[PDB]
Design an enzyme around this catalytic site. Structure first.
Site, short mmCIF file in Angstrom:
data_model
loop_
_atom_site.label_atom_id
_atom_site.label_comp_id
_atom_site.label_asym_id
_atom_site.label_seq_id
_atom_site.Cartn_x
_atom_site.Cartn_y
_atom_site.Cartn_z
CG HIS A 197 -0.45 0.18 2.47
ND1 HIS A 197 -0.14 -0.76 3.56
CD2 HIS A 197 -0.06 1.29 3.02
CE1 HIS A 197 0.19 -0.07 4.40
NE2 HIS A 197 0.23 1.19 4.25
N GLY A 247 2.93 6.52 9.12
CA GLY A 247 4.26 6.53 8.73
C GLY A 247 5.02 5.22 9.13
CB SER A 292 2.42 1.66 6.54
OG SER A 292 1.33 1.49 6.78
N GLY A 293 4.86 -0.59 6.57
CA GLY A 293 6.02 -1.00 5.58
C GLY A 293 7.05 -1.70 6.54
CG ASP A 304 -0.28 -3.84 2.88
OD1 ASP A 304 0.10 -3.44 1.80
OD2 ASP A 304 -0.67 -3.25 3.73
#
Ligand SMILES: O=C(/C=C/c1cc(Cl)ccc1-n1cnnn1)N[C@@H](Cc1ccccc1)C(=O)Nc1ccc(C(=O)O)cc1
Length: 238
Positions: A44, A186, A188-189, A93
């Site tokens: 995403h 911020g 995410s990932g 994701d």
């Protein structure tokens, strides 16, 4: 990260800050070094990213203020998004960034082990979520990398908390019943890193949640063990 504390330099050496230069340079997402030219992150993060040319990966960073025009970074050769990915809330994701150059391993930057297939039946009791994300829903990207220790939650318990969603076994949740500690905008990932037998494993990829650190709303993470075959398919292609 909500309810976290400043990390120490070199504490999470697999943690990277993925920046975009379009329209202006800023932190986009977190990521993890998993190989010498590979970053594992969330699909995403690339919504509306039309080219890998606008991306910059910075490793060995504790503080965002270490990043200026003269700071070295890794260019991204290719963005590989899971081809079943539609949206964070539906799963898949996960994405890989193939770097244009090789990461030189050292005490500031090194890879995190992927979970073992057999270890899908292990209870992780020492899990931490890290990132430069918000400390509350209305906030800003943090200068210093934050960390928070979060307990893993079973799929059954996470499904109870997310009525109207489908929490699959390709997702893994983490959070305190009363809230207070979680990932936020911020983060995410980035990794959900769990220590088992003195070795850190990349158990999750920060994906989504309803708000940040709310009571009975665990953070939802991509369950990395369910993607080990996909990661190897993509990173070990002949
Ligand atoms: O970081 C998160 C994770 C949320 C989450 C994950 C768990 Cl595990 C739990 C709770 C959660 N949250 C629920 N609500 N918020 N977080 N989401 C990203 C989504 C995104 C990615 C890329 C580009 C645009 C959007 C984000 O907001 N990123 C973002 C926001 C503001 C800024 C900026 O520079 O200001 C920069 C980056």
């Amino acid at each position: 990260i909500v309810g976290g504390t400043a990390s120490v330099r070199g504490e999470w050496p697999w943690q990277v800050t993925l920046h975009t230069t379009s329209p202006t340079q800023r932190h986009l997402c977190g990521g993890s070094i998993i190989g010498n030219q590979w970053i594992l992150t969330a699909a995403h993060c690339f919504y509306g990213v039309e080219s890998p040319k606008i991306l910059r990966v910075y490793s060995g960073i504790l503080n965002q203020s270490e990043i200026k025009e003269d700071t070295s970074f890794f260019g991204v050769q290719e963005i590989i998004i899971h081809d079943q990915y539609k949206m964070a809330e539906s799963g898949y994701d996960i994405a890989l960034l193939k770097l244009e150059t090789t990461v030189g391993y050292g005490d500031s930057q090194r890879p995190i082990c992927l979970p073992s297939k057999g270890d899908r039946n292990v209870i992780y009791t020492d899990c931490w979520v890290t990132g430069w994300g918000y400390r509350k829903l209305r906030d800003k990207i943090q200068n210093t990398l934050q960390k928070a220790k979060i307990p893993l939650v079973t799929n059954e318990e996470c499904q109870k908390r997310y009525r109207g969603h489908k929490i699959t076994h390709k997702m893994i949740c983490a959070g305190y019943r009363e809230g207070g500690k979680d990932a936020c905008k911020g983060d995410s990932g980035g990794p959900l890193s769990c220590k088992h037998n003195e070795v850190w494993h990349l158990v999750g990829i920060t994906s989504w949640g309803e708000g940040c650190a709310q009571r009975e709303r665990p953070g939802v993470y991509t369950n990395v063990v369910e993607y080990v075959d996909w990661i190897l398919e993509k990173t070990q292609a002949v």
